Write an enzyme that holds these catalytic residues in place. Structure first.
Site, mmCIF file in Angstrom:
data_model
loop_
_atom_site.group_PDB
_atom_site.id
_atom_site.type_symbol
_atom_site.label_atom_id
_atom_site.label_comp_id
_atom_site.label_asym_id
_atom_site.label_seq_id
_atom_site.Cartn_x
_atom_site.Cartn_y
_atom_site.Cartn_z
ATOM 1 N N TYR A 139 0.688 -1.160 0.008
ATOM 2 C CA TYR A 139 -0.103 -0.002 0.051
ATOM 3 C C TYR A 139 0.822 1.199 0.103
ATOM 4 O O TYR A 139 0.411 2.243 -0.497
ATOM 5 C CB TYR A 139 -0.931 0.118 1.212
ATOM 6 C CG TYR A 139 -2.088 -0.987 1.237
ATOM 7 C CD1 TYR A 139 -2.206 -1.590 0.092
ATOM 8 C CD2 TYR A 139 -2.691 -1.200 2.483
ATOM 9 C CE1 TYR A 139 -3.540 -2.754 0.073
ATOM 10 C CE2 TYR A 139 -3.754 -2.108 2.526
ATOM 11 C CZ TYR A 139 -3.960 -2.965 1.236
ATOM 12 O OH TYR A 139 -5.178 -3.662 1.351
ATOM 13 N N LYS A 185 2.958 -15.417 2.534
ATOM 14 C CA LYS A 185 2.860 -16.415 1.571
ATOM 15 C C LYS A 185 4.344 -16.960 1.344
ATOM 16 O O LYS A 185 5.039 -16.564 -0.088
ATOM 17 C CB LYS A 185 2.228 -15.649 0.317
ATOM 18 C CG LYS A 185 1.845 -16.351 -0.831
ATOM 19 C CD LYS A 185 0.825 -17.310 -0.512
ATOM 20 C CE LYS A 185 0.921 -18.282 -1.682
ATOM 21 N NZ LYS A 185 0.097 -19.541 -1.531
ATOM 22 N N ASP A 217 -3.752 -18.089 2.119
ATOM 23 C CA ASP A 217 -4.780 -18.782 1.206
ATOM 24 C C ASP A 217 -5.290 -20.004 2.151
ATOM 25 O O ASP A 217 -6.571 -19.910 2.365
ATOM 26 C CB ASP A 217 -4.319 -19.368 -0.057
ATOM 27 C CG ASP A 217 -3.114 -20.118 -0.032
ATOM 28 O OD1 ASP A 217 -2.192 -19.348 0.357
ATOM 29 O OD2 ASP A 217 -3.035 -21.291 -0.141
ATOM 30 N N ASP A 245 -11.158 -8.327 8.150
ATOM 31 C CA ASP A 245 -12.587 -8.145 7.480
ATOM 32 C C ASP A 245 -13.233 -9.719 7.379
ATOM 33 O O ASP A 245 -14.307 -9.715 7.800
ATOM 34 C CB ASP A 245 -12.644 -7.520 6.160
ATOM 35 C CG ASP A 245 -12.546 -5.953 6.126
ATOM 36 O OD1 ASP A 245 -12.268 -5.376 7.227
ATOM 37 O OD2 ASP A 245 -12.379 -5.435 5.381
#
Ligand SMILES: NC(=O)c1ccc[n+]([C@@H]2O[C@H](COP(=O)([O-])OP(=O)(O)OC[C@H]3O[C@@H](n4cnc5c(N)ncnc54)[C@H](O)[C@@H]3O)[C@@H](O)[C@H]2O)c1
Ligand SMILES: NC(=O)c1ccc[n+]([C@@H]2O[C@H](COP(=O)([O-])OP(=O)(O)OC[C@H]3O[C@@H](n4cnc5c(N)ncnc54)[C@H](O)[C@@H]3O)[C@@H](O)[C@H]2O)c1
Lengths: 345, 345
Positions: A139, A185, A217, A245
């Site tokens: 970000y 990851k 994942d 979330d």
């Protein structure tokens, strides 16, 4: 205990006064040194001071040991210049305090499984704390850009960035069930390998806390099939953004969710929900997220863990005795705060 | 209809023979031109040919109109050189065929809601197809690296990469309920802005299909609270990787999941599950994922959509009449395939 209290807009004053009634009652029975000052923040300050994070507020935040925020935003200030919106003053509050870890718990209180989107058996016992890194990763990474033929953005982490958010996770886990899952990851990305590598080493100075590593994942799958097995989950910024979330839908009500942003400066404690203009002034807003944010302040800003847990139990009994309208009951903000205080006494 | 059939290891032959019995019966009643050849693939070929994707197999894949794969992998070949593992020959199969879109559907068949981790009411009617971009994004992006103080990886997309995976989504949606959700992080990332921008323009040549855009963190929440509202969901590689695993927990059984990889070369159709060594040879493996992969072949490789749907209904009735052991019934692979064929006739 010097708290700056920024109630903001909408139902923000409503649920913040409820959190204040719990903190005041608790200060009597226990004798804390609660000293708090209410300030103008976002929207209420655009009106009085023409700008969302005014200079008195900034000084008050800077002088307090913790901030208890309510909610900002609203129609009245929506179409404004992006510089002066209530909503950007919220970014300015976190940025001015160098807050790099966002703590967001998702808990299914006993008897409240019926609200979870998940089957009762799976929803039972969920009490997970997602620690999200806030200041780095993709970000904010450079290089970034967009041509006509392509676009690029960079997921980048430095060693002190990872070390410090992982320390907040290890310390948080100590007050809880001493288990940290770090999410990455690492089987495909070198940033993942780096992240795992650094948290593992941080873990060595916390030998009383178990550390497990998981791929993002696979965490998305575990958070729906078996969320009740986790305690603290620490991860990067984009992954923390998705996972907190996902975990936040598990309780079944937006009014049940508290959050905390810890960092170098003054920590802010706030409800995940916004200013909810549609129910503002109707005396029915669920104050649970705000009262549990005040409990999170007792625990993370002042180390008062048994008192933080006392407030959570009182809130857990209140939700079963007189549930707010949003959990299908009829209790307004005042009638509900009173059930909580009955269970503190 | 020239199919190369690579049954692989474990239960791979078991569930592939079941898919073949359905394809053969269907070729009789309808008169397809089914012509298929069985080849040595991964593990079974390391034994015969000393290498997982042998030259006969490679030619057969190249000459066929579609591949129906089973499952590779196994203990017998686990500690090997990473060059020759069964498992890397699977990457070589997709890479040799330039497969850039991975299609993974998650469906809760009627009456099978009890298996979903989600409450019956929410699980009811889920039938979502996640189209994941396979060849680009951060998993392959350059620059990437790791020093002692930091690490970096690049999420990068070019305009033809996005356009072509979005075309597979628009075309897939046409055969289904004509609704595509594209998933990005466009409010923070320029790659997101670019992705949204390009799919929107691709959408203009498919005016019969509705296109909606969603942020990935919000899609993770919608996939648990209201998954039944979606039809096709197209997204980037890392986001597709997380979201297709999240959607894959919604049916409640790994043996129910088919997948497809479409691209420039020969499309491969396969069960999401692996070779399952523990139940191999016991005649109890659930063939549903393989039979639905063969149905996906009828639909995506040969455009035979009503026949693909006929096979899905027969499988839906079979799962209710004689459920396999993994859905709590007692039907072995043979007894179950026979219930399916009874419902095709
Ligand atoms: N600048 C930005 O980026 C930004 C982003 C988001 C929101 N905002 C601002 O903040 C406001 C947020 O309002 P919103 O509707 O988007 O979201 P919200 O979270 O305030 O409300 C969403 C829904 O949940 C309900 N709800 C929330 N808290 C509740 C509580 N404590 N008890 C009972 N019900 C509750 C609301 O009534 C509503 O039905 C907006 O007016 C907007 O201006 C700004
Ligand atoms: N090289 C790699 O990166 C890689 C990665 C993953 C797996 N593999 C290989 O493939 C094999 C995969 O086995 P695994 O155990 O990891 O996963 P799996 O998916 O084969 O099995 C997992 C579980 O689900 C069950 N299951 C799977 N399909 C079923 C079906 N159709 N019906 C009923 N039950 C079913 C299995 O019995 C087992 O209990 C391994 O032996 C491994 O060597 C290789």
């Amino acid at each position: 205990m010097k708290v700056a209290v920024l109630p903001g807009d909408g139902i923000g004053p409503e649920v913040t006064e409820a959190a204040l009634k719990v903190l005041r009652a608790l200060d009597e029975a226990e004798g804390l040194g609660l000293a708090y000052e209410v300030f103008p923040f976002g929207g209420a300050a655009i009106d009085a001071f023409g700008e969302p994070f005014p200079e008195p507020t900034r000084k008050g935040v800077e002088e307090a040991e913790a901030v208890l925020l309510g909610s900002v935003g609203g129609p009245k200030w929506d179409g404004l210049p992006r510089k002066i919106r209530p909503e950007t003053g919220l970014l300015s509050l976190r940025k001015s305090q160098d807050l790099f870890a966002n703590l967001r718990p998702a808990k299914v209180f006993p008897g409240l499984e019926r609200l979870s989107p998940l089957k009762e058996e799976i929803a039972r016992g969920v009490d997970v704390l997602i620690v999200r890194e806030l200041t780095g990763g993709i970000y904010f990474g450079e290089p970034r850009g967009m041509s006509e033929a392509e676009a690029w953005n960079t997921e980048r982490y430095s060693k002190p960035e990872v070390e410090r958010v992982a320390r907040v996770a290890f310390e948080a886990a100590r007050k809880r069930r001493k288990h940290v899952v770090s999410v990455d990851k690492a089987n495909v990305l070198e940033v993942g390998e780096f992240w795992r590598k650094t948290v593992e080493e941080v873990g060595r100075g916390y030998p009383d806390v178990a550390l497990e590593h998981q791929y993002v994942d696979a965490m998305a799958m575990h958070l729906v099939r078996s969320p009740a097995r986790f305690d603290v989950v620490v991860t990067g910024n984009i992954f923390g953004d998705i996972l907190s979330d996902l975990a936040s839908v598990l309780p079944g009500s937006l009014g049940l969710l508290p959050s905390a942003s810890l960092g170098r400066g003054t920590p802010v404690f706030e409800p995940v929900h916004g200013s909810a203009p549609d129910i503002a002034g109707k005396g029915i807003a669920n104050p649970t997220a705000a009262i549990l944010s005040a409990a999170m302040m007792l625990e993370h800003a002042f180390g008062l863990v048994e008192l933080a847990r006392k407030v959570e139990d009182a809130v857990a009994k209140a939700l079963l005795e007189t549930p707010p309208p949003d959990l299908g009951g009829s209790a307004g903000t005042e009638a509900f705060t009173a059930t909580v205080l009955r269970h503190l006494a």
